[PDB]
Design an enzyme around this catalytic site. Structure first.
Site, PDB file in Angstrom:
ATOM      1  CG  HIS A  25      -1.676  -1.289   1.326  1.00 50.22           C
ATOM      2  ND1 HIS A  25      -2.714  -1.588   0.469  1.00 50.22           N
ATOM      3  CD2 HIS A  25      -1.594  -2.321   2.189  1.00 50.22           C
ATOM      4  CE1 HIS A  25      -3.249  -2.744   0.816  1.00 50.22           C
ATOM      5  NE2 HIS A  25      -2.591  -3.204   1.865  1.00 50.22           N
ATOM      6  CG  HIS A  37       3.098   5.483   6.039  1.00 50.55           C
ATOM      7  ND1 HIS A  37       2.817   5.433   7.388  1.00 50.55           N
ATOM      8  CD2 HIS A  37       2.010   6.017   5.441  1.00 50.55           C
ATOM      9  CE1 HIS A  37       1.633   5.971   7.605  1.00 50.55           C
ATOM     10  NE2 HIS A  37       1.138   6.366   6.445  1.00 50.55           N
ATOM     11  CG  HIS A  60      -0.418   8.428   1.967  1.00 49.52           C
ATOM     12  ND1 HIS A  60      -1.188   7.288   1.933  1.00 49.52           N
ATOM     13  CD2 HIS A  60      -0.075   8.608   3.259  1.00 49.52           C
ATOM     14  CE1 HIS A  60      -1.333   6.824   3.160  1.00 49.52           C
ATOM     15  NE2 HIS A  60      -0.653   7.603   3.981  1.00 49.52           N
ATOM     16  CD  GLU A  78      -3.678   9.466   2.887  1.00 48.67           C
ATOM     17  OE1 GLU A  78      -3.422   9.453   4.099  1.00 48.67           O
ATOM     18  OE2 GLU A  78      -4.216   8.513   2.270  1.00 48.67           O
ATOM     19  CG  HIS A  88       0.772  10.161   7.126  1.00 50.12           C
ATOM     20  ND1 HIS A  88      -0.242   9.502   6.493  1.00 50.12           N
ATOM     21  CD2 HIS A  88       0.525  11.482   6.960  1.00 50.12           C
ATOM     22  CE1 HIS A  88      -1.088  10.370   5.977  1.00 50.12           C
ATOM     23  NE2 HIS A  88      -0.637  11.588   6.219  1.00 50.12           N
ATOM     24  CB  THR A 125      -5.739   8.022   5.764  1.00 47.40           C
ATOM     25  OG1 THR A 125      -4.431   7.511   5.513  1.00 47.40           O
ATOM     26  CG2 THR A 125      -5.657   9.324   6.528  1.00 47.40           C
ATOM     27  CB  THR A 126      -4.798   2.681   5.469  1.00 49.38           C
ATOM     28  OG1 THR A 126      -4.207   2.519   6.771  1.00 49.38           O
ATOM     29  CG2 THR A 126      -3.924   3.489   4.581  1.00 49.38           C
TER      30      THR A 126
HETATM   31  N1  LIG Z   1      -2.141   6.721   6.816  1.00 48.01           N
HETATM   32  S1  LIG Z   1      -2.184   6.628   8.457  1.00 48.01           S
HETATM   33  O1  LIG Z   1      -3.424   7.190   8.920  1.00 48.01           O
HETATM   34  O2  LIG Z   1      -0.958   7.098   9.041  1.00 48.01           O
HETATM   35  C1  LIG Z   1      -2.284   4.855   8.801  1.00 48.01           C
HETATM   36  C2  LIG Z   1      -1.393   3.940   7.971  1.00 48.01           C
HETATM   37  N2  LIG Z   1      -1.849   2.566   8.100  1.00 48.01           N
HETATM   38  C3  LIG Z   1      -0.975   1.551   8.299  1.00 48.01           C
HETATM   39  O3  LIG Z   1       0.248   1.655   8.446  1.00 48.01           O
HETATM   40  C4  LIG Z   1      -1.732   0.242   8.216  1.00 48.01           C
HETATM   41  C5  LIG Z   1      -3.023  -0.018   8.999  1.00 48.01           C
HETATM   42  C6  LIG Z   1      -2.642  -0.241  10.428  1.00 48.01           C
HETATM   43  C7  LIG Z   1      -2.738  -1.506  10.989  1.00 48.01           C
HETATM   44  C8  LIG Z   1      -2.347  -1.691  12.299  1.00 48.01           C
HETATM   45  C9  LIG Z   1      -1.875  -0.606  13.025  1.00 48.01           C
HETATM   46  O4  LIG Z   1      -1.483  -0.769  14.343  1.00 48.01           O
HETATM   47  C10 LIG Z   1      -1.779   0.662  12.488  1.00 48.01           C
HETATM   48 BR1  LIG Z   1      -1.129   2.100  13.559  1.00 48.01          BR
HETATM   49  C11 LIG Z   1      -2.161   0.833  11.165  1.00 48.01           C
HETATM   50  N3  LIG Z   1      -1.127  -0.537   7.380  1.00 48.01           N
HETATM   51  O5  LIG Z   1      -1.615  -1.821   7.059  1.00 48.01           O
HETATM   52 ZN   LIG Z   2      -0.550   7.505   6.059  1.00 45.31          ZN
END
Ligand SMILES: NS(=O)(=O)CCNC(=O)/C(Cc1ccc(O)c(Br)c1)=N/O
Ligand SMILES: [Zn+2]
Length: 257
Positions: A61, A91, A93, A103, A116, A195-196
């Site tokens: 992603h 990470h 976007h 975003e 982020h 946001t995911t």
């Molecule tokens: N764009 S964001 O809002 O910063 C969120 C980014 N989402 C991620 O890294 C994910 C989902 C996630 C899964 C478990 C977690 O404990 C956390 Br935390 C996030 N990846 O699968």
């Molecule tokens: Zn993010």
């Protein structure tokens, strides 16, 4: 299953994750003229000097850099936050073109990308428990615009060849996230969500007003990544952003006049 394409993208996410239509979803458009300066926000403290990066990973992603969060090394405090939040990962976007990719938007303006830095509230002990709380997480969001190169990003860019496809990872030690920050810590803040998927409504957003500049060559290297795993049809990892969601009852606060 979820992704960013026509048949699996953000407009589909609500079927598996009904909270996608919730009351505090992210990202949002930041109307700079509606945001209220809040003179009582405490100063923001970004304490990254003892950060310990571990790995860099293509998760299908985005790509992420992971940190050791087993002690209070790299933490965010102050501002709208109560207590101490530990850095887990960062990470990005980004877009297919330089005019989209962020975003959050600012007066409807999209940036080329958005960084982020994801942190969790230490009063909940681990990120999984934090994810279940309305104040479990704090994400520091930084916009990227294309212009001059960001030297502190280059070590990241140069390793992306080694993690082209979903599931690939590499060692990524001794990376200093301080090199990704703009001069100013002026910010907007609001209560929102991941946001995911799973789109959990547990995030205090802190979005810096000052973008960082990165070069065209740097962003071009992001766009060489693949969503697919090794052997599957090649689908460039581009446009991995969720669009702005309804603000609903919320107030965005500014740390500055
Ligand atoms: N764009 S964001 O809002 O910063 C969120 C980014 N989402 C991620 O890294 C994910 C989902 C996630 C899964 C478990 C977690 O404990 C956390 Br935390 C996030 N990846 O699968
Ligand atoms: Zn993010």
């Amino acid at each position: 299953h979820w992704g960013y394409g026509k048949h699996n993208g953000p407009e589909h996410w609500h079927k598996d994750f009904p909270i996608a239509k919730g009351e505090r979803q992210s990202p949002v458009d930041i109307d700079t003229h509606t945001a209220k300066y809040d003179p009582s926000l405490k100063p923001l403290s970004v304490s990254y000097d003892q950060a310990t990066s571990l790995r860099i990973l293509n998760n299908g992603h985005s790509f992420q850099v992971t940190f050791d969060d087993s002690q209070d090394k790299a933490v965010l405090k102050g501002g709208p936050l109560d207590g101490t939040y530990r850095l887990l990962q960062f990470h990005f976007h980004w877009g297919s073109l330089d005019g989209q990719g962020s975003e959050h938007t600012v007066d409807k303006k999209k940036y080329a990308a958005e960084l982020h830095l994801v942190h969790w509230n230490t009063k909940y002990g681990d990120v999984d428990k934090a994810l279940q709380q309305p104040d479990g997480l704090a994400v520091l969001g930084i916009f990227l615009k294309v212009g001059s190169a960001k030297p502190g990003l280059q070590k990241v860019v140069d390793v992306l060849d080694s993690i082209k496809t979903e599931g690939k990872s590499a060692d990524f030690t001794n990376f200093d996230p301080r090199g990704l920050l703009p001069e100013s810590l002026d910010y907007w803040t609001y209560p929102g969500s991941l946001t995911t998927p799973p789109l959990a409504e547990g995030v205090t957003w802190i979005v810096l007003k000052e973008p960082i500049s990165v070069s065209s060559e740097q962003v071009l290297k992001f766009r060489k990544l693949n969503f697919n795993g090794e052997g599957e049809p090649e689908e460039l990892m581009v446009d991995n952003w969720r669009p702005a969601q309804p603000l609903k009852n919320r107030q965005i606060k500014a740390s500055f006049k």
